Amino acid sequence: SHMYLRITNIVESSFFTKFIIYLIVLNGITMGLETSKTFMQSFGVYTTLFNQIVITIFTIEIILRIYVHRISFFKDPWSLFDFFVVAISLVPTSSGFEILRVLRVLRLFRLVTAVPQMRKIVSATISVIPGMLSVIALMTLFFYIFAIMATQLFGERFPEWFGTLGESFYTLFQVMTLESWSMGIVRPLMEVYPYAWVFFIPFIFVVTFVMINLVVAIIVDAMAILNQKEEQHIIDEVQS
Amino acid sequence: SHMYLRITNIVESSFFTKFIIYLIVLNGITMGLETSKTFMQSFGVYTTLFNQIVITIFTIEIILRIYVHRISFFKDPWSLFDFFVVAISLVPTSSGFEILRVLRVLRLFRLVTAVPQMRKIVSATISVIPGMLSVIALMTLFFYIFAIMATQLFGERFPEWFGTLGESFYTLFQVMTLESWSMGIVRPLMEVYPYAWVFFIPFIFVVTFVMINLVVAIIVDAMAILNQKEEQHIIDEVQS
Amino acid sequence: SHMYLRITNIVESSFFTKFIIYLIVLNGITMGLETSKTFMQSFGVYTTLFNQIVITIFTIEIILRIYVHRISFFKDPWSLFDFFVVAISLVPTSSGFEILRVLRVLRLFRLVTAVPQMRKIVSATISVIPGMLSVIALMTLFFYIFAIMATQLFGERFPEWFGTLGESFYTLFQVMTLESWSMGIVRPLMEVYPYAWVFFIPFIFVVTFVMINLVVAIIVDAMAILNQKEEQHIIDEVQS
Amino acid sequence: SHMYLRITNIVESSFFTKFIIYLIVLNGITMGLETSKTFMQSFGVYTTLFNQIVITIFTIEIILRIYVHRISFFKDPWSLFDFFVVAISLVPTSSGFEILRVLRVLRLFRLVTAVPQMRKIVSATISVIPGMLSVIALMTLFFYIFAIMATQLFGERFPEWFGTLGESFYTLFQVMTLESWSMGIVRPLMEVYPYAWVFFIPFIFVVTFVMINLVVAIIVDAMAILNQKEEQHIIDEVQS
Ligand SMILES: CCCCCCCCCCCCCC(=O)OC[C@H](COP(=O)(O)OCC[N+](C)(C)C)OC(=O)CCCCCCCCCCCCC
Ligand SMILES: CCCCCCCCCCCCCC(=O)OC[C@H](COP(=O)(O)OCC[N+](C)(C)C)OC(=O)CCCCCCCCCCCCC
Ligand SMILES: CCCCCCCCCCCCCC(=O)OC[C@H](COP(=O)(O)OCC[N+](C)(C)C)OC(=O)CCCCCCCCCCCCC
Ligand SMILES: CCCCCCCCCCCCCC(=O)OC[C@H](COP(=O)(O)OCC[N+](C)(C)C)OC(=O)CCCCCCCCCCCCC
Ligand SMILES: CCCCCCCCCCCCCC(=O)OC[C@H](COP(=O)(O)OCC[N+](C)(C)C)OC(=O)CCCCCCCCCCCCC
Ligand SMILES: CCCCCCCCCCCCCC(=O)OC[C@H](COP(=O)(O)OCC[N+](C)(C)C)OC(=O)CCCCCCCCCCCCC
Ligand SMILES: CCCCCCCCCCCCCC(=O)OC[C@H](COP(=O)(O)OCC[N+](C)(C)C)OC(=O)CCCCCCCCCCCCC
Ligand SMILES: CCCCCCCCCCCCCC(=O)OC[C@H](COP(=O)(O)OCC[N+](C)(C)C)OC(=O)CCCCCCCCCCCCC
């Protein structure tokens, strides 16, 4: 169309994306400065104004991008993100609760969706997850079973660490990271339950063994593929 | 046979295994809910009844599976597991001791033996163990020798950490994870035994060096095999 | 030239570099001895004299090397280093501030730039950095966004850990290393902000997931290259 | 010879080595039992007698092995070990100091030198060290320089952690393991030296970066070799 293609050339323009990026880095520096009560005392009204300025400009940009991109926009996770991040930034400050005033900062993550060198890393990193889903499932089932057992064995005398299923989940994650697992948790438990080490040490083994096996399997299964491609390429040349 | 083959078609049926799985996930949600004293106050008799219901249904299922599978059942580790897990769930609640009431929760692990996507992970993970057996042996002998030495050097002034061979084992495992090894253990020791760092730092080196070498050897010995298969496949095509 | 080539033969001589190295190891032993107040009480004037002796000899050496090497000297990072390290050692002790008296010790790092077996390690190690620059950028942006969020959510009640953007950076690095992350930080926070675990646990996941992915990608992308070289070498022989 | 070859057939016999191993496992169980004051009260004279029994039998065995093996014995590290371990076990209990009574336990390590499945692991593990020697050198030089700097910056106000070069070495190793590095060390320092984080965080980076690079280089340099062998094997078949 003609009215359509006018917009589409702006949105798709390098000036557009850059101008957005410069806003982001500008609002980024602003949100770090808003951290200083000294600064907010002096210049606090400027950056509050600079904020919705950026908010609306981002709202407009989001709208245009939807007009240009159509349904392809709501099937693009980076666009979907930019949508919700700017959406969050839109519910009213006063009428809301404080937690939404803080989530405003997530708009700074647009610097990731904008800069393509950044998307690729996030994609690389996230790419390995879908193969781990069954492992994540198993690990969670594991935590679950042990959290139920812990809550029953230790919650009555140790409510802070194990009084509820949720609390026991948390402590077991703590033990998985090994943070103060022994001086902070098991040694105290053992003053009342001498055999507690029979619970947590195997827990520490399974959790540790599994995670390591995950990394070895990721590394070693990848090179098997590299060898598969290499093998066939070399086999082809032999074959002609 | 005819009486035999009637059963065998049910046990081997997809409806069967699914129905078991649905029970498991149902008893799983029940065992998490039984964690709440609020819930047990209100609905506590329902889930206690739902429990032996599931217990007997699992008992029956275990029996049928033995009739169908014969001696092949007691040579299958997944079946052997499901056996003992359901067995444990069968000794009486009142007459027993509390620890068996908790082991009941292990039946939730049937969701692993049932779901084949899960078995494969556990098999993958456990597969690497038999090659490590001599390394596990060496590490244990190592802990053993050092536990005897620690108990003798430090148990008299530090009975909580080193009074007995069992306690010294435990502290040495703690030091292996590095959890509070220095502020919590060696620094206190050194107020009385200034040279204690000569004991634990080499301990921290050997233990650490060995474990890392275990992971490198696992990764690197695997790709040697991948290269062996690849080499011969490629060598064959060259050979014809 | 003739005056030039006289010097150039000394600087480039094996005796030269060795003599410098022997000074370095000598000043190294001296700087460790200067650590003892007993020793400084007895022999403190000797090593203070031995110090500027070495300082000037290193100054002279640096000058000669610049005469010999010309502009190639200021394009060589090892020389540039040796320059600034000896430069630092030159500002006056009395008139300065204590921190420059300590930076004097960095001259001991010349033993690295001197010994070529050492340079190669540092080069190997530093070689992998330029590919990580965008990952370092992303991680820093990440810390930044979360530091702003933390300062806002937790600084008012927890000023030591989160009162300022700088402090929150520091605590988040602490949490990244996992050092006392739960007993020391999140558990205290949760007495006032029960949902704080929703902040730090995802933080602990992203940070951990990313770093691991960095190591796997480094290992696995390298062997892809090794396979590329190997593939073509083998493909060539097939091709003739 | 004839007197020689009589002995040589015993020493080299499978019965010999086994009999030694059975002693070792027997003295091993004895040294764990000697740990119990209950047991030493009851059966303490038996195991003290069983001890020099084993000591002399091991002395004799060591002698025979030297007669049989000649100078080849003192060029064999496993034999050299068994020598010194049994030697240590020989200096007198009463006249000595307690530390030699404890080193007696090292004889249990003969179970490693005896069992060949064990030697191979220790050899594998130790095999990777000689390539790391220059890296170990660099890391130690690094600790050294930073230990001198720490002692000067922080020893006067923090003598326990940094009063001497030896103490600062120890704390820096603690920081390398990250054990309580921040709550236990840097945070206290920063109450007096706000910029202390500029010292330890880069320290934590270098130390961490180097060690990781060591593991990646070990893994990745090994597969380069595997590819080299594979490449030439495959290239040969192409060549005929
Ligand atoms: C090897 C790779 C995988 C490694 C991880 C395996 C999965 C296990 C992760 C567990 C994480 C810890 C969860 C946690 O913090 O538990 C707390 C929550 C909420 O209970 P709540 O009582 O509100 O929290 C404690 C509140 N308190 C202390 C102030 C009274 O307790 C709950 O009710 C939450 C339980 C569900 C958590 C689901 C996590 C799924 C995995 C996350 C996705 C991973 C993708 C990479
Ligand atoms: C065998 C496989 C089965 C899979 C089942 C997965 C789903 C499990 C659902 C059951 C959740 C049970 C939660 C529960 O009992 O909550 C306990 C507490 C509340 O305790 P309560 O005493 O009710 O608090 C009273 C509070 N008052 C006085 C103010 C009224 O609240 C909490 O502690 C927080 C709730 C924690 C939920 C953790 C969810 C873990 C998901 C695991 C997923 C496994 C995937 C394979
Ligand atoms: C690099 C890979 C391998 C890494 C691990 C190497 C093997 C060493 C693991 C040692 C684990 C720690 C053992 C432990 O907790 O020791 C405590 C037990 C029981 O003594 P007890 O006095 O009852 O416990 C202390 C009681 N207290 C403090 C309340 C007075 O002390 C004992 O008497 C138990 C001693 C035998 C433990 C056997 C462990 C064998 C390895 C486990 C299988 C690994 C398969 C992956
Ligand atoms: C050179 C290779 C030799 C291999 C030998 C392996 C087997 C070792 C068996 C010897 C175990 C000795 C155990 C021992 O002495 O127990 C000490 C304490 C009990 O102290 P005690 O003073 O008797 O307690 C009195 C209690 N009272 C007052 C109520 C009567 O009880 C404890 O502290 C718990 C017992 C700890 C046992 C740890 C087992 C480690 C196995 C290492 C396997 C190495 C494989 C290569
Ligand atoms: C996976 C690989 C990458 C892993 C690391 C990712 C990057 C994040 C590293 C963050 C390091 C922690 C920074 C830190 O210590 O923050 C403190 C500083 C100074 O603020 P200040 O308020 O002076 O410090 C606290 C003072 N106090 C507590 C006594 C009141 O706060 C600041 O203002 C400093 C903020 C900028 C730090 C820039 C770091 C860039 C990365 C370093 C280069 C890496 C090359 C390998
Ligand atoms: C979306 C991407 C945007 C990228 C922007 C990167 C640059 C950010 C610049 C903004 C820095 C804001 C610093 C700031 O607000 O400082 C707060 C505090 C000072 O608080 P204040 O209350 O002013 O202290 C008063 C002291 N008195 C009473 C003696 C006068 O001072 C501190 O806490 C120390 C300053 C911390 C600086 C941390 C720098 C992080 C760099 C991140 C780089 C990201 C790269 C992609
Ligand atoms: C990435 C791979 C390599 C990783 C390690 C790199 C090398 C650095 C390791 C440093 C280990 C820590 C040394 C240590 O504990 O320092 C203490 C000693 C003795 O000083 P002292 O004042 O007696 O000890 C403190 C006594 N106090 C607290 C009770 C008053 O201080 C000293 O004077 C000892 C200084 C020399 C230690 C030499 C260590 C060389 C490396 C070990 C061999 C590695 C082979 C795998
Ligand atoms: C640039 C490369 C140069 C390489 C040089 C390597 C060798 C260094 C030798 C210098 C060692 C200096 C040791 C030193 O000053 O000791 C300080 C303290 C003793 O303090 P002090 O105040 O004398 O104690 C008086 C005690 N009283 C009252 C009872 C008489 O004693 C201690 O704190 C313990 C001694 C610590 C020694 C640490 C050795 C590290 C070796 C690093 C190897 C690097 C290899 C590349």
Numbering used by the authors:
A (entry chain A), B (entry chain A), C (entry chain A), D (entry chain A): 999 to 1238
Paper text:
pmcVoltage-gated sodium (NaV) channels initiate and propagate action potentials in nerves and muscles, and mutations in NaV channels lead to many diseases of hyperexcitability. Structural studies of the homotetrameric bacterial sodium channel NaVAb showed that these four homologous domains come together to form a functional channel with an ion-conducting pore at its center. To overcome these limitations, we introduced these IEM mutations into NaVAb, a bacterial ancestor of mammalian NaV channels, confirmed their functional effects in negatively shifting the voltage dependence of channel activation, and determined their structures at high resolution by X-ray crystallography. All of these structures have their VSs in the activated state, as determined by the outward position of the gating charges in the S4 segment, while the PM is closed at the activation gate formed by the intracellular ends of the S6 segments.
NaVAb/Leu123 is analogous to Ile848 in DII of NaV1.7, which is conservatively replaced by Leu in the other three domains of NaV1.7. Electrophysiological recordings of NaVAb/L123T show a shift of −15.5 mV in Va, similar to negative shifts in Va of −13.8 mV to −7.5 mV in previous studies of NaV1.7/I848T. The structure of NaVAb/L123T in the activated state at 2.7-Å resolution indicates that the substituted Thr side chain forms a hydrogen bond with the highly conserved Asn211 side chain in the S6 segment of a neighboring subunit (referred to as Asn211′). Asn211 is a conserved residue that is important for electromechanical coupling and critical for the gating process by bridging interactions between the S4-S5 linker and the S6 activation gate. In the WT structure, Asn211′ forms part of the wall of the ion-conducting pore with its side chain pointing toward the lumen, while also interacting with Val126 in the S4-S5 linker. In the L123T structure, the Asn211′ side chain adopts a different rotamer that points away from the lumen of the pore toward the S4-S5 linker and forms a hydrogen bond with a distance of ~3.1 Å to the hydroxyl oxygen of the L123T side chain. The hydrogen bond formed between these two residues from the S4-S5 linker and the S6′ segment would provide additional stabilization of the activated state and therefore significantly shift voltage-dependent activation to more negative membrane potentials. In contrast, the native Leu side chain in the NaVAb resting state makes an additional hydrophobic interaction with the conserved Phe207’ residue located one helical turn from Asn211′. This interaction is absent in the L123T structure as the length of the side chain is reduced by the mutation, suggesting destabilization of the resting state by this mutation. Therefore, the loss of the hydrophobic interaction in the resting state and the gain of a hydrogen bond in the activated state both likely contribute to the large negative shift in Va.
